[PDB]
Amino acid sequence: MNAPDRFELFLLGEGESKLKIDPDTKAPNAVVITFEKEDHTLGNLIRAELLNDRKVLFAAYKVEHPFFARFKLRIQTTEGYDPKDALKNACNSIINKLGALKTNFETEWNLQTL
Amino acid sequence: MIVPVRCFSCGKVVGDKWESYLNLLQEDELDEGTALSRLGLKRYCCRRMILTHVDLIEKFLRYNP
Amino acid sequence: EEGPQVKIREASKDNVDFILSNVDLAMANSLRRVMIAEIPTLAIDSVEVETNTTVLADEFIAHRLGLIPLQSMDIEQLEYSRDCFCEDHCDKCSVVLTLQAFGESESTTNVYSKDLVIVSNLMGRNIGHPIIQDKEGNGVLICKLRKGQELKLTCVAKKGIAKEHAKWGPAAAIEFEYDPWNKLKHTDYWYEQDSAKEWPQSKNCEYEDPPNEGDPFDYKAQADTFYMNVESVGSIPVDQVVVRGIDTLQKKVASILLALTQMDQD
Amino acid sequence: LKYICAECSSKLSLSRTDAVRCKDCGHRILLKARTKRLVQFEAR
Amino acid sequence: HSKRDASTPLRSTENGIVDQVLVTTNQDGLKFVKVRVRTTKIPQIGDKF
Ligand SMILES: [Zn+2]
Ligand SMILES: [Zn+2]
Ligand SMILES: [Zn+2]
């Protein structure tokens, strides 16, 4: 009756962009990125992968309300290091690890029976 | 009503196991636990899903309309 | 290879018990969440009922039809109806299968998922076929007819995500456990007398070394090893459940990367 | 239009100025038949 | 305009599908009707359990 459509969890609305990169006014060299139509699945993973980068000072994601499928990701990097590059490196790292994981799982699957 | 097609909690298909369950109870004369075990219902949510079900449709079919 | 490692402890048509090594907790978790929610599957999304003189209500039966597991092997070469340039649905986006049942015998006439008949053109793609893991080859018991009761309907199955509705869930329960000895101390066990004696010992305890009382607490250790068991429903084979889970996660990461690539436009 | 009796498998087509009862039965309980225009269902 | 309307509207807040329409004469020979509408209610935020 007042329940929103389910596809609104993953289908981008009218005018809604995937990422909304905003300059953080609190701490210098910081940024807050709004991920639309995504949840903890992407947020926790990217945040955890951003803590591996030793040139990243801060990294935290939050879902301000479980009704809406979106989360904010705040990133603070060292000077001379753009945070978007940190996000990109994090993403690429994730993709590489997942590719290796998939390949390994596949080669491990071929050596099985039943 | 009729045996739920899938288990609410996890999602394991259980709608294909009702008749097999009844047979395991009457034909092999097993108890509910072993019958549910042989049907591959290890998690107690599915175990519940079949054990807890009441097949009311069998009474619903007693009317002619 | 060079990264995260897999060790298939057990493998069957329905279940895969394996061990993820050299992985972050978040990646294992996210892999689980994807395997549960975000893997494309084919299920009945539309039901047109012509005649229904059975006991059950129309949308009741329709619900049960929605939950039926269908073959989703070549689902990646099927398309979303929302993305397809056709009107409503077609053969490139949806799979149409009929159901015509009628009470014939004096006894109860059962209506199974095997009675579903594909009408649309599959054009080569392994898709639409209702999974029958049943021993007698019947499948899901859809309904029951009396003597003169009839069920005539048509089902349009569309590509869907389990995040939209649980009927598109390719996986059942995903077993997930790390650090069986609680050496990381992520859990403060509730007890009455002896903690270890009251709490049952996990099977995975056989796969790690027990702590020594002479040794202190390892504060620098993280979570590397994860014991998982992925169970499929039939729409997608287990190996392909975890593989397409990985592929999906990777893909939606690549979508964010692509978004970043696109935000550089003036 | 057409109707159907309650306690027998009949198929009456008696419109207005007729109504009750039934053809070869005797009871006055008449139900209306299902529509011809098919209704869809989001199988959810 | 030789007729006054006495038609019956579906509940303003409710909705559903016409499940079964019953037409029957009364004891005084009055043609009266009972219309049954079916609606499947799914558990929602605010439902009492
Ligand atoms: Zn279950
Ligand atoms: Zn189409
Ligand atoms: Zn009659």
UniProtKB/Swiss-Prot annotation, chain A:
Alphabetized PROSITE patterns for the sequence: RNA_POL_L_13KD
Alphabetized UniProt keyword annotations: DNA-directed RNA polymerase, Nucleus, Transcription
Note: Present with 4280 molecules/cell in log phase SD medium.
Protein family membership: Belongs to the archaeal Rpo11/eukaryotic RPB11/RPC19 RNA polymerase subunit family.
GO biological process: RNA-templated transcription; termination of RNA polymerase II transcription; transcription by RNA polymerase II; transcription elongation by RNA polymerase II; transcription initiation at RNA polymerase II promoter
One cellular component (GO) term of this entry: RNA polymerase II, core complex
Protein location: Nucleus
Protein name listed in UniProt: DNA-directed RNA polymerase II subunit RPB11
Function recorded in the entry: DNA-dependent RNA polymerase catalyzes the transcription of DNA into RNA using the four ribonucleoside triphosphates as substrates. Component of RNA polymerase II which synthesizes mRNA precursors and many functional non-coding RNAs. Pol II is the central component of the basal RNA polymerase II transcription machinery. It is composed of mobile elements that move relative to each other. RPB11 is part of the core element with the central large cleft. Seems to be involved transcript termination.
Swiss-Prot record, chain B:
Predominant cellular place of this UniProt entry's protein: nucleus
Protein location: Nucleus, Nucleolus
GO biological process: nucleolar large rRNA transcription by RNA polymerase I; ribosome biogenesis; RNA-templated transcription; termination of RNA polymerase I transcription; termination of RNA polymerase III transcription; transcription by RNA polymerase I; transcription by RNA polymerase II; transcription by RNA polymerase III
Cellular-component GO terms for this entry: nucleoplasm; nucleus; RNA polymerase I complex; RNA polymerase II, core complex; RNA polymerase III complex
Coiled-coil stretches: none
Cross-linked sites for Glycyl lysine isopeptide (Lys-Gly) (interchain with G-Cter in ubiquitin): 59
Binding site for Zn(2+): 7, 10, 45-46
Superkingdom of origin: Eukaryota
UniProt GO MF annotations: DNA binding; DNA-directed RNA polymerase activity; zinc ion binding
Alphabetical list of Pfam families matching this protein: RNA_pol_N
Keywords: DNA-directed RNA polymerase, Isopeptide bond, Metal-binding, Nucleus, Ribosome biogenesis, Transcription, Ubl conjugation, Zinc
Note: Present with 5300 molecules/cell in log phase SD medium.
Quaternary structure, from the entry: Component of the RNA polymerase I (Pol I), RNA polymerase II (Pol II) and RNA polymerase III (Pol III) complexes. Component of the RNA polymerase I (Pol I) complex consisting of 14 subunits: RPA135, RPA190, RPC40, RPA14, RPB5, RPO26, RPA43, RPB8, RPA12, RPB10, RPC19, RPC10, RPA49 and RPA34. The complex is composed of a horseshoe-shaped core containing ten subunits (RPA135, RPA190, RPB5, RPO26, RPB8, RPB10, RPC10, RPA12, RPC19 and RPC40) where RPA135 and RPA190 form the DNA-binding cleft.
UniProtKB/Swiss-Prot annotation, chain D:
Zinc finger (C4-type): 5-25
Positions that bind Zn(2+): 5, 8, 22, 25
GO cellular component: cytoplasm; nucleolus; nucleoplasm; nucleus; peroxisome; RNA polymerase I complex; RNA polymerase II, core complex; RNA polymerase III complex
Superkingdom classification of source: Eukaryota
Record has Nucleus as a keyword: yes
UniProt subcellular location: Nucleus, Nucleolus; Peroxisome
Protein name: DNA-directed RNA polymerases I, II, and III subunit RPABC4
Lineage: Eukaryota, Fungi, Dikarya, Ascomycota, Saccharomycotina
Gene it is expressed from: RPC10
First and last residues shown, out of full length: 27 to 70 of 70
From Swiss-Prot, chain E:
Top-level taxon in the UniProt lineage: Eukaryota
Organism in which the protein naturally occurs: Saccharomyces cerevisiae (strain ATCC 204508 / S288c)
Gene label: RPB2
Misc note: The binding of ribonucleoside triphosphate to the RNA polymerase II transcribing complex probably involves a two-step mechanism. The initial binding seems to occur at the entry (E) site and involves a magnesium ion coordinated by three conserved aspartate residues of the two largest RNA Pol II subunits.
Lineage, uppermost ranks: Eukaryota, Fungi, Dikarya, Ascomycota, Saccharomycotina
Complex formation: Component of the RNA polymerase II (Pol II) complex consisting of 12 subunits.
Role played: DNA-dependent RNA polymerase catalyzes the transcription of DNA into RNA using the four ribonucleoside triphosphates as substrates. Second largest component of RNA polymerases II which synthesizes mRNA precursors and many functional non-coding RNAs. Proposed to contribute to the polymerase catalytic activity and forms the polymerase active center together with the largest subunit. Pol II is the central component of the basal RNA polymerase II transcription machinery.
Compartments in which it is found: Nucleus
Similarity remark: Belongs to the RNA polymerase beta chain family.
Protein name per the record: DNA-directed RNA polymerase II subunit RPB2
